[PDB]
Amino acid sequence: GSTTTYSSFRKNYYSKPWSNKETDMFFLAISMVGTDFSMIGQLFPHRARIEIKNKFKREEKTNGWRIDKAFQEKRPFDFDFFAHLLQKVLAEEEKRK
Amino acid sequence: CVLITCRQHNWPLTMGAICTLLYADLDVFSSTYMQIVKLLGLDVPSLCLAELVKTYCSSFKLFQASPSVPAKYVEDKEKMLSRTMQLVELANETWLVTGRHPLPVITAATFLAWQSLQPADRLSCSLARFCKLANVDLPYPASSRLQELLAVLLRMAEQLAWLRVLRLDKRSVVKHIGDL
DNA sequence: TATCCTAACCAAAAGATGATTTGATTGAAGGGCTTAAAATAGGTGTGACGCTCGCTTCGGCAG
DNA sequence: CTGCCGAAGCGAGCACTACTGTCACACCTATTTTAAGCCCTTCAATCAAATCATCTTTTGGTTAGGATA
């Protein structure tokens, strides 16, 4: 302990960077779920709802056109299929890498 | 309350020293401070730049020999404090302090002033390698302020031929500030 | 010969020198958040309160 | 067989532990745009130190360049 207790803003913690296939899956969920960030957070257990909102905010800066294109590329919704796709594609990414 | 009181009597103090005791958090006490001040509408001075250096520089252990700081590390407080005053006067007019946390500026200025008072024994040191010997902790923005000031002095040096002739850079300029 | 001094120079001692890779430094971003504001809806959980005249106790005979 | 009145004894005013419950509102839910800073990994790109390949001066020492004994 010392009197020189430096203080600075730490709320900007290190979060795991978003993966490219994870972003593709986010767009797929936009197409097949919608913008229900809570249910997306359930679909992405790695990502909490606030991360989903942050992803929406960052993507809409330039990729809002892709948000719309995905949202119109509607698909039947299945939680189990989405989970299998997520894990399988991530494992295939690891194997390719 | 004690913060505002000390400010009225311009008694030096900083947030961290107080908040180490109260189990406080930046958001909590900063928001409470804003609420109280805007509720009561009280006037209060700001932290004067030179106000805090006087007590801060006196906190260093560089002024007497110790196993952590042999004589080649020991230095006289007067010379370094004069150098740091001559550096902070440069800092503000160069817009460096406005909108920033000042203590990084003070840390960088003190580190470089101490280095340049005996650079041959001190150019081999480093920010952390320094601060740990005097039992001091340093900001990460201290490096940012160091880069800023190094750019400023390299900009300064080219104006004089008898400094320009040495083709100064980051490595060499530290020992020449005594001339600049 | 057997040997030392000692130009030039082998061989190593030793003294040191130019370029490369690898350990280290670095910019900028990934990413995360704040004050300044507008606000109304629903809630639940905390925590206001140095004597020396006066006065007290109890035995040993009178009647 | 009651009790008067003696003898022994102490005393003091002057000393130039609390709840505790209601209750009300602090506390939240929801956000949206700056604009600077501060924040840790993380990647991408470059800089910096020890070693490797190489040149040179002396000691050992020869041939050869030179000499004594």
mmCIF file of N, CA, C and O in Angstrom, chain A residues 3-88:
data_model
loop_
_atom_site.group_PDB
_atom_site.id
_atom_site.type_symbol
_atom_site.label_atom_id
_atom_site.label_comp_id
_atom_site.label_asym_id
_atom_site.label_seq_id
_atom_site.Cartn_x
_atom_site.Cartn_y
_atom_site.Cartn_z
ATOM 1 N N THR A 3 0.483 5.856 -0.820
ATOM 2 C CA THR A 3 -0.403 6.995 -1.032
ATOM 3 C C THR A 3 -0.667 7.258 -2.507
ATOM 4 O O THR A 3 -1.669 7.900 -2.840
ATOM 5 N N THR A 4 0.204 6.781 -3.398
ATOM 6 C CA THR A 4 0.054 7.017 -4.833
ATOM 7 C C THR A 4 -0.904 5.990 -5.443
ATOM 8 O O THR A 4 -0.547 5.185 -6.302
ATOM 9 N N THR A 5 -2.150 6.035 -4.973
ATOM 10 C CA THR A 5 -3.194 5.121 -5.435
ATOM 11 C C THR A 5 -3.791 5.691 -6.715
ATOM 12 O O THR A 5 -4.752 6.463 -6.693
ATOM 13 N N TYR A 6 -3.208 5.308 -7.849
ATOM 14 C CA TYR A 6 -3.674 5.809 -9.134
ATOM 15 C C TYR A 6 -5.091 5.325 -9.412
ATOM 16 O O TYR A 6 -5.444 4.178 -9.120
ATOM 17 N N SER A 7 -5.907 6.210 -9.981
ATOM 18 C CA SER A 7 -7.301 5.915 -10.284
ATOM 19 C C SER A 7 -7.585 6.271 -11.734
ATOM 20 O O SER A 7 -7.219 7.357 -12.195
ATOM 21 N N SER A 8 -8.235 5.356 -12.446
ATOM 22 C CA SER A 8 -8.648 5.591 -13.823
ATOM 23 C C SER A 8 -9.844 4.699 -14.116
ATOM 24 O O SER A 8 -10.180 3.801 -13.341
ATOM 25 N N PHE A 9 -10.485 4.960 -15.251
ATOM 26 C CA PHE A 9 -11.776 4.357 -15.549
ATOM 27 C C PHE A 9 -11.567 2.952 -16.107
ATOM 28 O O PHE A 9 -10.932 2.783 -17.154
ATOM 29 N N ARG A 10 -12.098 1.945 -15.410
ATOM 30 C CA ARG A 10 -11.844 0.545 -15.728
ATOM 31 C C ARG A 10 -13.063 -0.183 -16.287
ATOM 32 O O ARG A 10 -12.972 -1.380 -16.576
ATOM 33 N N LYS A 11 -14.192 0.501 -16.482
ATOM 34 C CA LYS A 11 -15.372 -0.193 -16.990
ATOM 35 C C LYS A 11 -15.134 -0.785 -18.372
ATOM 36 O O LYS A 11 -15.897 -1.657 -18.800
ATOM 37 N N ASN A 12 -14.097 -0.335 -19.075
ATOM 38 C CA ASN A 12 -13.774 -0.857 -20.402
ATOM 39 C C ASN A 12 -12.895 -2.103 -20.282
ATOM 40 O O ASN A 12 -11.727 -2.129 -20.674
ATOM 41 N N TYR A 13 -13.490 -3.153 -19.723
ATOM 42 C CA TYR A 13 -12.787 -4.409 -19.521
ATOM 43 C C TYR A 13 -12.537 -5.116 -20.853
ATOM 44 O O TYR A 13 -13.168 -4.825 -21.872
ATOM 45 N N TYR A 14 -11.600 -6.062 -20.827
ATOM 46 C CA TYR A 14 -11.286 -6.872 -22.001
ATOM 47 C C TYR A 14 -12.377 -7.912 -22.214
ATOM 48 O O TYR A 14 -12.486 -8.877 -21.452
ATOM 49 N N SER A 15 -13.184 -7.718 -23.251
ATOM 50 C CA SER A 15 -14.150 -8.709 -23.690
ATOM 51 C C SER A 15 -13.600 -9.467 -24.893
ATOM 52 O O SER A 15 -12.797 -8.939 -25.667
ATOM 53 N N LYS A 16 -14.036 -10.712 -25.042
ATOM 54 C CA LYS A 16 -13.564 -11.533 -26.147
ATOM 55 C C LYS A 16 -13.993 -10.910 -27.475
ATOM 56 O O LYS A 16 -15.172 -10.570 -27.640
ATOM 57 N N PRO A 17 -13.082 -10.739 -28.435
ATOM 58 C CA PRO A 17 -13.484 -10.197 -29.737
ATOM 59 C C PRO A 17 -14.508 -11.084 -30.428
ATOM 60 O O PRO A 17 -14.555 -12.300 -30.233
ATOM 61 N N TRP A 18 -15.342 -10.452 -31.250
ATOM 62 C CA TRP A 18 -16.383 -11.166 -31.977
ATOM 63 C C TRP A 18 -15.785 -11.871 -33.189
ATOM 64 O O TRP A 18 -14.989 -11.287 -33.930
ATOM 65 N N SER A 19 -16.172 -13.129 -33.387
ATOM 66 C CA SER A 19 -15.664 -13.912 -34.502
ATOM 67 C C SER A 19 -16.452 -13.613 -35.776
ATOM 68 O O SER A 19 -17.603 -13.170 -35.740
ATOM 69 N N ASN A 20 -15.806 -13.861 -36.919
ATOM 70 C CA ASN A 20 -16.449 -13.607 -38.203
ATOM 71 C C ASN A 20 -17.602 -14.575 -38.442
ATOM 72 O O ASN A 20 -18.699 -14.163 -38.843
ATOM 73 N N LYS A 21 -17.376 -15.870 -38.206
ATOM 74 C CA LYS A 21 -18.473 -16.824 -38.304
ATOM 75 C C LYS A 21 -19.528 -16.552 -37.243
ATOM 76 O O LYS A 21 -20.720 -16.773 -37.481
ATOM 77 N N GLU A 22 -19.115 -16.056 -36.076
ATOM 78 C CA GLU A 22 -20.088 -15.646 -35.070
ATOM 79 C C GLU A 22 -20.937 -14.485 -35.576
ATOM 80 O O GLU A 22 -22.145 -14.435 -35.325
ATOM 81 N N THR A 23 -20.323 -13.539 -36.291
ATOM 82 C CA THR A 23 -21.091 -12.442 -36.880
ATOM 83 C C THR A 23 -22.053 -12.952 -37.949
ATOM 84 O O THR A 23 -23.201 -12.494 -38.035
ATOM 85 N N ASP A 24 -21.597 -13.891 -38.780
ATOM 86 C CA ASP A 24 -22.488 -14.491 -39.767
ATOM 87 C C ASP A 24 -23.667 -15.170 -39.086
ATOM 88 O O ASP A 24 -24.807 -15.080 -39.555
ATOM 89 N N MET A 25 -23.409 -15.860 -37.974
ATOM 90 C CA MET A 25 -24.482 -16.524 -37.243
ATOM 91 C C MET A 25 -25.423 -15.506 -36.610
ATOM 92 O O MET A 25 -26.629 -15.747 -36.508
ATOM 93 N N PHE A 26 -24.884 -14.369 -36.165
ATOM 94 C CA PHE A 26 -25.727 -13.292 -35.654
ATOM 95 C C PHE A 26 -26.669 -12.780 -36.735
ATOM 96 O O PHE A 26 -27.861 -12.564 -36.490
ATOM 97 N N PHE A 27 -26.146 -12.577 -37.946
ATOM 98 C CA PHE A 27 -27.008 -12.161 -39.051
ATOM 99 C C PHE A 27 -28.033 -13.240 -39.386
ATOM 100 O O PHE A 27 -29.192 -12.935 -39.693
ATOM 101 N N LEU A 28 -27.626 -14.509 -39.333
ATOM 102 C CA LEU A 28 -28.570 -15.596 -39.572
ATOM 103 C C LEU A 28 -29.690 -15.585 -38.539
ATOM 104 O O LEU A 28 -30.855 -15.820 -38.874
ATOM 105 N N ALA A 29 -29.351 -15.331 -37.274
ATOM 106 C CA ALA A 29 -30.368 -15.245 -36.231
ATOM 107 C C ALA A 29 -31.283 -14.047 -36.453
ATOM 108 O O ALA A 29 -32.496 -14.135 -36.232
ATOM 109 N N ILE A 30 -30.718 -12.915 -36.879
ATOM 110 C CA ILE A 30 -31.546 -11.773 -37.257
ATOM 111 C C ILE A 30 -32.548 -12.188 -38.323
ATOM 112 O O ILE A 30 -33.734 -11.840 -38.258
ATOM 113 N N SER A 31 -32.085 -12.943 -39.318
ATOM 114 C CA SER A 31 -32.982 -13.429 -40.360
ATOM 115 C C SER A 31 -34.052 -14.348 -39.788
ATOM 116 O O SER A 31 -35.227 -14.257 -40.165
ATOM 117 N N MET A 32 -33.665 -15.236 -38.874
ATOM 118 C CA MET A 32 -34.500 -16.359 -38.477
ATOM 119 C C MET A 32 -35.170 -16.170 -37.121
ATOM 120 O O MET A 32 -36.168 -16.845 -36.847
ATOM 121 N N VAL A 33 -34.664 -15.277 -36.276
ATOM 122 C CA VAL A 33 -35.350 -14.884 -35.045
ATOM 123 C C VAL A 33 -35.941 -13.487 -35.163
ATOM 124 O O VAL A 33 -37.142 -13.293 -34.976
ATOM 125 N N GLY A 34 -35.106 -12.505 -35.489
ATOM 126 C CA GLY A 34 -35.485 -11.109 -35.395
ATOM 127 C C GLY A 34 -34.541 -10.365 -34.474
ATOM 128 O O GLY A 34 -33.417 -10.822 -34.241
ATOM 129 N N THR A 35 -34.971 -9.218 -33.946
ATOM 130 C CA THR A 35 -34.130 -8.386 -33.091
ATOM 131 C C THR A 35 -34.445 -8.564 -31.607
ATOM 132 O O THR A 35 -34.278 -7.622 -30.823
ATOM 133 N N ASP A 36 -34.896 -9.750 -31.203
ATOM 134 C CA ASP A 36 -35.160 -10.043 -29.794
ATOM 135 C C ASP A 36 -33.830 -10.381 -29.128
ATOM 136 O O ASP A 36 -33.440 -11.544 -29.020
ATOM 137 N N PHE A 37 -33.130 -9.343 -28.663
ATOM 138 C CA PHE A 37 -31.785 -9.531 -28.126
ATOM 139 C C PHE A 37 -31.754 -10.450 -26.912
ATOM 140 O O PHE A 37 -30.717 -11.062 -26.647
ATOM 141 N N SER A 38 -32.857 -10.568 -26.169
ATOM 142 C CA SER A 38 -32.882 -11.503 -25.047
ATOM 143 C C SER A 38 -32.844 -12.945 -25.543
ATOM 144 O O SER A 38 -32.063 -13.772 -25.048
ATOM 145 N N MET A 39 -33.676 -13.265 -26.534
ATOM 146 C CA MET A 39 -33.712 -14.635 -27.029
ATOM 147 C C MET A 39 -32.436 -14.942 -27.804
ATOM 148 O O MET A 39 -31.965 -16.083 -27.800
ATOM 149 N N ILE A 40 -31.854 -13.930 -28.456
ATOM 150 C CA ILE A 40 -30.535 -14.090 -29.063
ATOM 151 C C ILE A 40 -29.487 -14.384 -27.998
ATOM 152 O O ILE A 40 -28.624 -15.252 -28.179
ATOM 153 N N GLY A 41 -29.537 -13.665 -26.875
ATOM 154 C CA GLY A 41 -28.610 -13.943 -25.792
ATOM 155 C C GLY A 41 -28.737 -15.364 -25.284
ATOM 156 O O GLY A 41 -27.737 -16.005 -24.953
ATOM 157 N N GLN A 42 -29.967 -15.876 -25.216
ATOM 158 C CA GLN A 42 -30.142 -17.292 -24.899
ATOM 159 C C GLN A 42 -29.539 -18.176 -25.984
ATOM 160 O O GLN A 42 -28.892 -19.186 -25.682
ATOM 161 N N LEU A 43 -29.743 -17.816 -27.253
ATOM 162 C CA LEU A 43 -29.164 -18.589 -28.348
ATOM 163 C C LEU A 43 -27.645 -18.511 -28.337
ATOM 164 O O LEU A 43 -26.971 -19.501 -28.645
ATOM 165 N N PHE A 44 -27.092 -17.351 -27.990
ATOM 166 C CA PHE A 44 -25.656 -17.203 -27.802
ATOM 167 C C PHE A 44 -25.356 -17.135 -26.310
ATOM 168 O O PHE A 44 -25.210 -16.037 -25.757
ATOM 169 N N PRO A 45 -25.257 -18.275 -25.622
ATOM 170 C CA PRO A 45 -24.939 -18.231 -24.188
ATOM 171 C C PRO A 45 -23.601 -17.579 -23.895
ATOM 172 O O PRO A 45 -23.406 -17.064 -22.787
ATOM 173 N N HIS A 46 -22.674 -17.585 -24.854
ATOM 174 C CA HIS A 46 -21.409 -16.884 -24.670
ATOM 175 C C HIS A 46 -21.608 -15.376 -24.595
ATOM 176 O O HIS A 46 -20.789 -14.674 -23.990
ATOM 177 N N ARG A 47 -22.678 -14.861 -25.195
ATOM 178 C CA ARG A 47 -22.927 -13.430 -25.282
ATOM 179 C C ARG A 47 -24.174 -13.084 -24.481
ATOM 180 O O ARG A 47 -25.245 -13.652 -24.719
ATOM 181 N N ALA A 48 -24.037 -12.154 -23.540
ATOM 182 C CA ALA A 48 -25.194 -11.673 -22.806
ATOM 183 C C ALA A 48 -25.943 -10.624 -23.629
ATOM 184 O O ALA A 48 -25.461 -10.133 -24.653
ATOM 185 N N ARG A 49 -27.145 -10.284 -23.161
ATOM 186 C CA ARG A 49 -28.044 -9.442 -23.946
ATOM 187 C C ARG A 49 -27.419 -8.085 -24.253
ATOM 188 O O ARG A 49 -27.636 -7.523 -25.335
ATOM 189 N N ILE A 50 -26.640 -7.538 -23.317
ATOM 190 C CA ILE A 50 -26.018 -6.239 -23.557
ATOM 191 C C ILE A 50 -24.975 -6.344 -24.667
ATOM 192 O O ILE A 50 -24.810 -5.416 -25.467
ATOM 193 N N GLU A 51 -24.267 -7.477 -24.753
ATOM 194 C CA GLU A 51 -23.368 -7.683 -25.887
ATOM 195 C C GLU A 51 -24.146 -7.744 -27.194
ATOM 196 O O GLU A 51 -23.669 -7.268 -28.228
ATOM 197 N N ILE A 52 -25.341 -8.337 -27.175
ATOM 198 C CA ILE A 52 -26.148 -8.393 -28.390
ATOM 199 C C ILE A 52 -26.567 -6.990 -28.812
ATOM 200 O O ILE A 52 -26.521 -6.641 -30.001
ATOM 201 N N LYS A 53 -26.981 -6.164 -27.850
ATOM 202 C CA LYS A 53 -27.329 -4.783 -28.172
ATOM 203 C C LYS A 53 -26.122 -4.030 -28.719
ATOM 204 O O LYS A 53 -26.243 -3.258 -29.680
ATOM 205 N N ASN A 54 -24.950 -4.235 -28.116
ATOM 206 C CA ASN A 54 -23.742 -3.576 -28.603
ATOM 207 C C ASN A 54 -23.404 -4.025 -30.020
ATOM 208 O O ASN A 54 -22.981 -3.215 -30.852
ATOM 209 N N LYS A 55 -23.571 -5.318 -30.307
ATOM 210 C CA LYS A 55 -23.346 -5.814 -31.660
ATOM 211 C C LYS A 55 -24.298 -5.152 -32.645
ATOM 212 O O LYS A 55 -23.889 -4.747 -33.738
ATOM 213 N N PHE A 56 -25.576 -5.043 -32.278
ATOM 214 C CA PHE A 56 -26.529 -4.343 -33.134
ATOM 215 C C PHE A 56 -26.076 -2.912 -33.396
ATOM 216 O O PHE A 56 -26.074 -2.445 -34.542
ATOM 217 N N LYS A 57 -25.686 -2.199 -32.337
ATOM 218 C CA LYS A 57 -25.296 -0.801 -32.486
ATOM 219 C C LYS A 57 -24.065 -0.660 -33.374
ATOM 220 O O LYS A 57 -23.993 0.254 -34.204
ATOM 221 N N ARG A 58 -23.081 -1.546 -33.211
ATOM 222 C CA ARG A 58 -21.874 -1.449 -34.027
ATOM 223 C C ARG A 58 -22.162 -1.803 -35.481
ATOM 224 O O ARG A 58 -21.669 -1.136 -36.397
ATOM 225 N N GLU A 59 -22.957 -2.852 -35.715
ATOM 226 C CA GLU A 59 -23.229 -3.278 -37.084
ATOM 227 C C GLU A 59 -24.069 -2.250 -37.832
ATOM 228 O O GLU A 59 -23.858 -2.027 -39.030
ATOM 229 N N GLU A 60 -25.025 -1.611 -37.151
ATOM 230 C CA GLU A 60 -25.899 -0.669 -37.840
ATOM 231 C C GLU A 60 -25.168 0.579 -38.320
ATOM 232 O O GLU A 60 -25.736 1.338 -39.113
ATOM 233 N N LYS A 61 -23.934 0.811 -37.866
ATOM 234 C CA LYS A 61 -23.197 1.987 -38.317
ATOM 235 C C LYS A 61 -22.935 1.934 -39.817
ATOM 236 O O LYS A 61 -23.067 2.949 -40.512
ATOM 237 N N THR A 62 -22.565 0.769 -40.333
ATOM 238 C CA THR A 62 -22.327 0.591 -41.764
ATOM 239 C C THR A 62 -23.104 -0.577 -42.351
ATOM 240 O O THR A 62 -23.550 -0.494 -43.498
ATOM 241 N N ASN A 63 -23.279 -1.664 -41.596
ATOM 242 C CA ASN A 63 -23.916 -2.875 -42.102
ATOM 243 C C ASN A 63 -25.412 -2.925 -41.817
ATOM 244 O O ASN A 63 -25.984 -4.021 -41.728
ATOM 245 N N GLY A 64 -26.068 -1.773 -41.671
ATOM 246 C CA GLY A 64 -27.516 -1.777 -41.531
ATOM 247 C C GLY A 64 -28.202 -2.375 -42.743
ATOM 248 O O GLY A 64 -29.241 -3.033 -42.624
ATOM 249 N N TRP A 65 -27.631 -2.154 -43.930
ATOM 250 C CA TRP A 65 -28.150 -2.803 -45.128
ATOM 251 C C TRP A 65 -28.111 -4.317 -44.982
ATOM 252 O O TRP A 65 -29.049 -5.012 -45.388
ATOM 253 N N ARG A 66 -27.037 -4.851 -44.392
ATOM 254 C CA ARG A 66 -26.977 -6.291 -44.173
ATOM 255 C C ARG A 66 -27.965 -6.728 -43.104
ATOM 256 O O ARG A 66 -28.517 -7.828 -43.191
ATOM 257 N N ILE A 67 -28.207 -5.887 -42.097
ATOM 258 C CA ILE A 67 -29.242 -6.196 -41.115
ATOM 259 C C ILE A 67 -30.585 -6.369 -41.811
ATOM 260 O O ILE A 67 -31.306 -7.344 -41.575
ATOM 261 N N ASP A 68 -30.936 -5.425 -42.690
ATOM 262 C CA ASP A 68 -32.204 -5.524 -43.408
ATOM 263 C C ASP A 68 -32.230 -6.743 -44.325
ATOM 264 O O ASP A 68 -33.229 -7.473 -44.374
ATOM 265 N N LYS A 69 -31.138 -6.979 -45.056
ATOM 266 C CA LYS A 69 -31.092 -8.102 -45.986
ATOM 267 C C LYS A 69 -31.261 -9.425 -45.251
ATOM 268 O O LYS A 69 -31.980 -10.317 -45.718
ATOM 269 N N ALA A 70 -30.603 -9.570 -44.101
ATOM 270 C CA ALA A 70 -30.790 -10.757 -43.278
ATOM 271 C C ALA A 70 -32.224 -10.848 -42.774
ATOM 272 O O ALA A 70 -32.870 -11.894 -42.895
ATOM 273 N N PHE A 71 -32.751 -9.745 -42.236
ATOM 274 C CA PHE A 71 -34.092 -9.762 -41.664
ATOM 275 C C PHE A 71 -35.131 -10.180 -42.694
ATOM 276 O O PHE A 71 -36.132 -10.816 -42.342
ATOM 277 N N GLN A 72 -34.917 -9.836 -43.964
ATOM 278 C CA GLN A 72 -35.819 -10.279 -45.020
ATOM 279 C C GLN A 72 -35.514 -11.688 -45.513
ATOM 280 O O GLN A 72 -36.345 -12.270 -46.219
ATOM 281 N N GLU A 73 -34.355 -12.247 -45.164
ATOM 282 C CA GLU A 73 -34.001 -13.613 -45.555
ATOM 283 C C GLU A 73 -34.520 -14.608 -44.514
ATOM 284 O O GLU A 73 -33.782 -15.399 -43.929
ATOM 285 N N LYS A 74 -35.834 -14.566 -44.309
ATOM 286 C CA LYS A 74 -36.450 -15.278 -43.200
ATOM 287 C C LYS A 74 -36.334 -16.790 -43.376
ATOM 288 O O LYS A 74 -36.250 -17.308 -44.493
ATOM 289 N N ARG A 75 -36.330 -17.494 -42.246
ATOM 290 C CA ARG A 75 -36.110 -18.933 -42.184
ATOM 291 C C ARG A 75 -36.915 -19.499 -41.024
ATOM 292 O O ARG A 75 -37.184 -18.779 -40.054
ATOM 293 N N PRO A 76 -37.312 -20.773 -41.084
ATOM 294 C CA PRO A 76 -37.925 -21.398 -39.906
ATOM 295 C C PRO A 76 -36.971 -21.379 -38.719
ATOM 296 O O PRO A 76 -35.751 -21.465 -38.873
ATOM 297 N N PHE A 77 -37.542 -21.258 -37.522
ATOM 298 C CA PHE A 77 -36.776 -21.074 -36.294
ATOM 299 C C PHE A 77 -36.759 -22.377 -35.508
ATOM 300 O O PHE A 77 -37.815 -22.953 -35.225
ATOM 301 N N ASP A 78 -35.558 -22.838 -35.168
ATOM 302 C CA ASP A 78 -35.371 -23.994 -34.298
ATOM 303 C C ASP A 78 -34.163 -23.734 -33.410
ATOM 304 O O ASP A 78 -33.061 -23.494 -33.915
ATOM 305 N N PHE A 79 -34.372 -23.771 -32.092
ATOM 306 C CA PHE A 79 -33.277 -23.533 -31.156
ATOM 307 C C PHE A 79 -32.205 -24.611 -31.272
ATOM 308 O O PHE A 79 -31.005 -24.305 -31.314
ATOM 309 N N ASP A 80 -32.622 -25.879 -31.332
ATOM 310 C CA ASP A 80 -31.662 -26.977 -31.363
ATOM 311 C C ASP A 80 -30.803 -26.925 -32.620
ATOM 312 O O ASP A 80 -29.585 -27.143 -32.563
ATOM 313 N N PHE A 81 -31.424 -26.650 -33.770
ATOM 314 C CA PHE A 81 -30.665 -26.535 -35.009
ATOM 315 C C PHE A 81 -29.644 -25.412 -34.921
ATOM 316 O O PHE A 81 -28.501 -25.565 -35.365
ATOM 317 N N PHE A 82 -30.041 -24.268 -34.358
ATOM 318 C CA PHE A 82 -29.115 -23.148 -34.243
ATOM 319 C C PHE A 82 -27.942 -23.503 -33.339
ATOM 320 O O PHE A 82 -26.792 -23.166 -33.641
ATOM 321 N N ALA A 83 -28.214 -24.187 -32.225
ATOM 322 C CA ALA A 83 -27.135 -24.596 -31.329
ATOM 323 C C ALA A 83 -26.171 -25.549 -32.028
ATOM 324 O O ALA A 83 -24.944 -25.386 -31.947
ATOM 325 N N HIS A 84 -26.710 -26.565 -32.710
ATOM 326 C CA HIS A 84 -25.849 -27.496 -33.432
ATOM 327 C C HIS A 84 -25.020 -26.775 -34.483
ATOM 328 O O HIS A 84 -23.824 -27.046 -34.630
ATOM 329 N N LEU A 85 -25.635 -25.857 -35.228
ATOM 330 C CA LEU A 85 -24.893 -25.120 -36.243
ATOM 331 C C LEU A 85 -23.769 -24.315 -35.608
ATOM 332 O O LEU A 85 -22.634 -24.318 -36.097
ATOM 333 N N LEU A 86 -24.062 -23.631 -34.502
ATOM 334 C CA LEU A 86 -23.043 -22.828 -33.835
ATOM 335 C C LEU A 86 -21.853 -23.685 -33.423
ATOM 336 O O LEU A 86 -20.705 -23.395 -33.790
ATOM 337 N N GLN A 87 -22.109 -24.766 -32.678
ATOM 338 C CA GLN A 87 -20.998 -25.582 -32.194
ATOM 339 C C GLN A 87 -20.253 -26.249 -33.345
ATOM 340 O O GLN A 87 -19.017 -26.282 -33.351
ATOM 341 N N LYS A 88 -20.981 -26.781 -34.332
ATOM 342 C CA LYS A 88 -20.328 -27.462 -35.445
ATOM 343 C C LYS A 88 -19.454 -26.506 -36.245
ATOM 344 O O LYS A 88 -18.321 -26.846 -36.603
#
